[PDB]
Amino acid sequence: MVLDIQLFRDETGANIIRESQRRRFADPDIVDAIIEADKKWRRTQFLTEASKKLINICSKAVGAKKKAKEADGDTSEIPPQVKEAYENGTLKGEQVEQLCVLQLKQLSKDLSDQVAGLAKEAQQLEEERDKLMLNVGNILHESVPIAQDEETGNTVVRTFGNTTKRAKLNHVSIMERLGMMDTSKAVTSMAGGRSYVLKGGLVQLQVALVSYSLDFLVKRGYTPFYPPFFLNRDVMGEVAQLSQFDEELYQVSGDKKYLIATSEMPIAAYHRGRWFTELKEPLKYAGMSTCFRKEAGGRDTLGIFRVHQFDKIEQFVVCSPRQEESWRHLEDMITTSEEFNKSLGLPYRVVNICSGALNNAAAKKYDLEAWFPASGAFRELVSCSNCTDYQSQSVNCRYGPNLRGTAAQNVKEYCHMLNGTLCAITRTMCCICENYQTEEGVVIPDVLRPYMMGIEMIRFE
Amino acid sequence: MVLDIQLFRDETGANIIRESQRRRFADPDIVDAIIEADKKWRRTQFLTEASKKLINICSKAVGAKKKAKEADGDTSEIPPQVKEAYENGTLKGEQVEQLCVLQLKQLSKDLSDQVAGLAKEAQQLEEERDKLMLNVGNILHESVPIAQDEETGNTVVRTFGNTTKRAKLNHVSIMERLGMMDTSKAVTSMAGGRSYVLKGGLVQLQVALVSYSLDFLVKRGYTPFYPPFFLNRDVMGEVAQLSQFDEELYQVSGDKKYLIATSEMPIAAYHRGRWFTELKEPLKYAGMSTCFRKEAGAHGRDTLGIFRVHQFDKIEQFVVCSPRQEESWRHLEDMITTSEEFNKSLGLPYRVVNICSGALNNAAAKKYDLEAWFPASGAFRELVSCSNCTDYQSQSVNCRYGPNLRGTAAVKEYCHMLNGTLCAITRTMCCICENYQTEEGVVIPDVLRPYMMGIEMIRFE
Numbered sequence: 001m002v003l004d005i006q007l008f009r010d011e012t013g014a015n016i017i018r019e020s021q022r023r024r025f026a027d028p029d030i031v032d033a034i035i036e037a038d039k040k041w042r043r044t045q046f047l048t049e050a051s052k053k054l055i056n057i058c059s060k061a062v063g064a065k066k067k068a069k070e071a072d073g074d075t076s077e078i079p080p081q082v083k084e085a086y087e088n089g090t091l092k093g094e095q096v097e098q099l100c101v102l103q104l105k106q107l108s109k110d111l112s113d114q115v116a117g118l119a120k121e122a123q124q125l126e127e128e129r130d131k132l133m134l135n136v137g138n139i140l141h142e143s144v145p146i147a148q149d150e151e152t153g154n155t156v157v158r159t160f161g162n163t164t165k166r167a168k169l170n171h172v173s174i175m176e177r178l179g180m181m182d183t184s185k186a187v188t189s190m191a192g193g194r195s196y197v198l199k200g201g202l203v204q205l206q207v208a209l210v211s212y213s214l215d216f217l218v219k220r221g222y223t224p225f226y227p228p229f230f231l232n233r234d235v236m237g238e239v240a241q242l243s244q245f246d247e248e249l250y251q252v253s254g255d256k257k258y259l260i261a262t263s264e265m266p267i268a269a270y271h272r273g274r275w276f277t278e279l280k281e282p283l284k285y286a287g288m289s290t291c292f293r294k295e296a297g298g299r300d301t302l303g304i305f306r307v308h309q310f311d312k313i314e315q316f317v318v319c320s321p322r323q324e325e326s327w328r329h330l331e332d333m334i335t336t337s338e339e340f341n342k343s344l345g346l347p348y349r350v351v352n353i354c355s356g357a358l359n360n361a362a363a364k365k366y367d368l369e370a371w372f373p374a375s376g377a378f379r380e381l382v383s384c385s386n387c388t389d390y391q392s393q394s395v396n397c398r399y400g401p402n403l404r405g406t407a408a409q410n411v412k413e414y415c416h417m418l419n420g421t422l423c424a425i426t427r428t429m430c431c432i433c434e435n436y437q438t439e440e441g442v443v444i445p446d447v448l449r450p451y452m453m454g455i456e457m458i459r460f461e
Numbered sequence: 462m463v464l465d466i467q468l469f470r471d472e473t474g475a476n477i478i479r480e481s482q483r484r485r486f487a488d489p490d491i492v493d494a495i496i497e498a499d500k501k502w503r504r505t506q507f508l509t510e511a512s513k514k515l516i517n518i519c520s521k522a523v524g525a526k527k528k529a530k531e532a533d534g535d536t537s538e539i540p541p542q543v544k545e546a547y548e549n550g551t552l553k554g555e556q557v558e559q560l561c562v563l564q565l566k567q568l569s570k571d572l573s574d575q576v577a578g579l580a581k582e583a584q585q586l587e588e589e590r591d592k593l594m595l596n597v598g599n600i601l602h603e604s605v606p607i608a609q610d611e612e613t614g615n616t617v618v619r620t621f622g623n624t625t626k627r628a629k630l631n632h633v634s635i636m637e638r639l640g641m642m643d644t645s646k647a648v649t650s651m652a653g654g655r656s657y658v659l660k661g662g663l664v665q666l667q668v669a670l671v672s673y674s675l676d677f678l679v680k681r682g683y684t685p686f687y688p689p690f691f692l693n694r695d696v697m698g699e700v701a702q703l704s705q706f707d708e709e710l711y712q713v714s715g716d717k718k719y720l721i722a723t724s725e726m727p728i729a730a731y732h733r734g735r736w737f738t739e740l741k742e743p744l745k746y747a748g749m750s751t752c753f754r755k756e757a758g759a760h761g762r763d764t765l766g767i768f769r770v771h772q773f774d775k776i777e778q779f780v781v782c783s784p785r786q787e788e789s790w791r792h793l794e795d796m797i798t799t800s801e802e803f804n805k806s807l808g809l810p811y812r813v814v815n816i817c818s819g820a821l822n823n824a825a826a827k828k829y830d831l832e833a834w835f836p837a838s839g840a841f842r843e844l845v846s847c848s849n850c851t852d853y854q855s856q857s858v859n860c861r862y863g864p865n866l867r868g869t870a871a872v873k874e875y876c877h878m879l880n881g882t883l884c885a886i887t888r889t890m891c892c893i894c895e896n897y898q899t900e901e902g903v904v905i906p907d908v909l910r911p912y913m914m915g916i917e918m919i920r921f922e
């Protein structure tokens with residue numbers, strides 16, 4: 001499944017989706033195309049159910065006639081009114097019982113052929129419906145700025161620190177003079193473009209950030225989560241769009257698998273087919289993994305700002321879909337990322353991403369863009385998104401009572417899910433280097449010193 | 462390049478290799494097959510050099526004739542005696558100078574065609590020689606025990622701690638009862654066999670081990686080294702045996718690459734084509750990486766828990782040193798002592814074993830394994846391997862040593878290289894769990910507590 005069909009079948013729900021499509025600069029007509037494909041699909045299902053019941057009647061009639069030792073009959077030919085009736089879903093059980101054993105055996109096979117034909121029609125309509133559902137965005141939060149272009153369209157929500165600060169050397173120049181980063185042909189001729197080696201103090205800083213970030217989230221009630229870095233094609237397909245297979249995901253062969261681009265992928269996939277009857281407390285995971293990205297879509301080629309391989313500590317929340325609880329968690333998650341950057345003393349701004357720039361799963365997204373003083377620019381360090389029930393529909397992670405036997409339950413409920421960067425390690429190191437540089441090297445932010453043998457500064461070579 | 466040919470061309474050197482082959486229970490005749498392949502190769506090179514010189518003589522002779530306005534000649538037809546002479550490498554320049562311009566032009570083209578054919582023959586002979594060299598073992602150290610089978614042949618050299626104590630639960634049972642390890646279908650249906658999720662206290666323990674292990678080597682003068690996790694086919698081929706591609710290495714497609722099985726692979730490859738004139742101090746690296754192994758040779762062995770998984774963190778010792786005065790043998794002793802001191806600091810009992818000649822991999826001239834005591838499993842299990850690869854890997858990656866001056870003509874010196882596990886993280890976690898178990902959970906070894914928020918124990922759920 002891509003999305004549950006239930007909201008599309010509801011008049012109010014379909015209007016809510018069309019409005020959200022318009023507000024995202026996406027196509028509202030996709031809603032109408034899904035409704036039409038589902039209408040044809042429901043017809044195949046109505047005919048399937050009618051004909052499966054008629055197959056059972058044939059089996060029961062053959063049994064009754066053979067137990068009563070009745071002769072098979074003269075013909076196996078089906079009357080034209082019988083064929084017309086089952087093709088239209090109007091064949092009655094009384095007309096079937098009037099047939100002889102030979103005809104009942106023929107009719108059971110013909111009805112089985114019709115069910116096989118209807119299943120192929122149903123599968124083609126499911127493929128059409130699912131492909132259209134891939135172009136349906138999550139319902140926008142009402143606070144999302146309406147604009148197509150990120151450059152002008154995003155809204156600045158908050159700022160921290162000296163965001164006009166200027167510094168001498170950029171992160172590339174700093175990491176070169178430290179002698180602790182190698183992005184030369186000695187590395188790229190071994191491992192391809194955007195590959196790197198870190199040495200000495202920069203590796204100590206990398207480990208200090210990993211450990212400090214994990215502890216930062218443990219103190220806030222998150223459970224550390226270390227995932228497999230591979231996902232099979234079918235499972236990856238539930239947690240990644242088709243454009244990610246082309247532009248972002250490496251394929252691994254040992255079944256063919258894909259390297260994860262973020263711990264968000266295996267954490268979301270870990271909840272596939274689950275059902276939580278209540279979530280009085282949300283599930284909070286502190287994802288820790290290496291991330292692998294093809295970066296196929298020559299921007300930021302220098303240093304370790306945008307590399308294929310990088311560590312990232314992630315916030316991931318699974319919560320009740322009721323009373324807009326996920327919207328409270330979104331605010332906590334961006335506040336957590338902000339508190340983290342304030343503890344490192346990195347200046348930044350928080351932006352509310354415009355409607356035309358949001359990926360399909362996000363109902364709302366906040367980015368924290370840190371100020372790079374030598375580069376003289378705000379650069380994305382963090383994305384925090386509320387995916388409401390969008391990913392939960394794709395992985396089938398249910399919530400609350402099941403429909404059957406519960407008179408008050410008329411809708412299939414799904415958990416809400418959110419994800420938010422806590423620390424993307426290599427890009428944070430670039431930001432630290434620019435912000436903490438001196439003529440002697442890079443000063444270690446105070447909070448990280450106990451995490452790297454009390455080192456106060458890493459020196460230029 | 463696989464091995465340097467110099468030792469094979471020397472009568473004494475060839476006998477040293479043959480003797481080492483016999484001592485390893487390997488084929489001594491491989492030395493003779495290499496000499497023969499090299500004899501045929503040297504013949505293609507003698508003819509190539511002779512014919513290249515004759516092409517230059519043709520060009521100079523045409524130039525002199527054109528300047529003098531000598532008639533171009535009656536025919537371009539080459540005397541059969543001339544063809545026979547250049548095919549045998551006996552054609553003299555004085556005879557070439559007797560030809561007319563038309564014959565000199567024809568001969569230059571014929572000689573260029575011969576050079577092209579000889580280059581194809583040389584390529585085939587180089588491939589043959591290289592395939593045979595892969596089956597040549599490194600020259601064994603004189604102290605290596607001579608035996609085929611590890612069970613009886615390996616020698617126990619040292620023991621530490623209580624190696625007879627028994628315990629109730631094995632590492633699998635403990636990690637299950639902690640509720641901190643998931644190896645169920647929720648994980649294997651998304652990531653395949655031997656895949657896992659770690660949660661909570663076990664992730665905190667994993668990070669504590671990574672950071673403590675890195676600091677342990679920093680205090681001993683090793684430089685932290687964080688490598689790329691991919692290597693191209695050609696580069697991986699210089700640091701991995703043929704059997705590793707089939708049994709151990711995952712292929713990545715983004716130019717085809719391979720995931721690293723250990724940071725030893727990219728650290729050795731980082732030294733390719735390098736030439737250190739002197740190494741008054743050795744190069745000491747503390748490799749830190751995730752490791753990826755297909756474990757195809759295991760075939761349903763150590764399937765349970767995280768003892769032998771496809772993906773695991775490992776902290777590695779890697780040394781590049783002078784090939785002179787038996788220095789690398791002093792480094793091997795220091796490296797195994799470092800791994801011993803590390804396990805003593807964790808309070809883990811173990812034995813150190815000197816690996817017999819028949820069980821050594823081709824690159825190792827000597828290897829020590831540290832096998833820790835698993836009290837509930839009731840067995841010594843390998844946690845560490847420390848090898849002196851002398852100049853074997855250096856010949857493959859072309860890492861030279863010694864005076865490097867203008868005017869030096871055709872004994873080539875190579876650096877020595879050593880590698881040794883400091884901590885294989887998941888396997889050390891299994892060992893800690895068995896040794897530190899109580900009725901309530903797992904006690905955290907004292908030295909790791911500051912690396913995991915002062916936590917003294919992780920509790921059963």
Ligand SMILES: Nc1ccn([C@@H]2O[C@H](COS(=O)(=O)NC(=O)[C@@H](N)CO)[C@@H](O)[C@H]2O)c(=O)n1
Nearest residue numbers: 262264306307380381382383419420421424427
């Ligand atoms: N090659 C790259 C690509 C990205 N990044 C950094 O990862 C952060 C999260 O990536 S995300 O794609 O914006 N969202 C996610 O992955 C969500 N799971 C939330 O974490 C970015 O904000 C950027 O700072 C990098 O450092 N190198």
Ligand SMILES: Nc1ccn([C@@H]2O[C@H](COS(=O)(=O)NC(=O)[C@@H](N)CO)[C@@H](O)[C@H]2O)c(=O)n1
Nearest residue numbers: 723725769770843844845846880881882885888
């Ligand atoms: N699937 C697996 C396979 C191995 N290991 C652990 O890696 C150690 C080093 O591996 S090595 O293959 O024995 N040598 C090396 O890789 C060298 N570079 C020295 O480190 C083993 O001694 C074992 O304890 C594991 O934990 N899981």
Ligand code: NA
Nearest residue numbers: 162163164165
């Ligand atoms: Na300012």
Ligand code: NA
Nearest residue numbers: 170171374375
């Ligand atoms: Na810059």
Ligand code: NA
Nearest residue numbers: 367380382383
């Ligand atoms: Na982003």
Ligand code: NA
Nearest residue numbers: 403406407409
């Ligand atoms: Na109901």
Ligand code: NA
Nearest residue numbers: 631632837838
């Ligand atoms: Na066991």
Ligand code: NA
Nearest residue numbers: 830843845846
């Ligand atoms: Na080993």
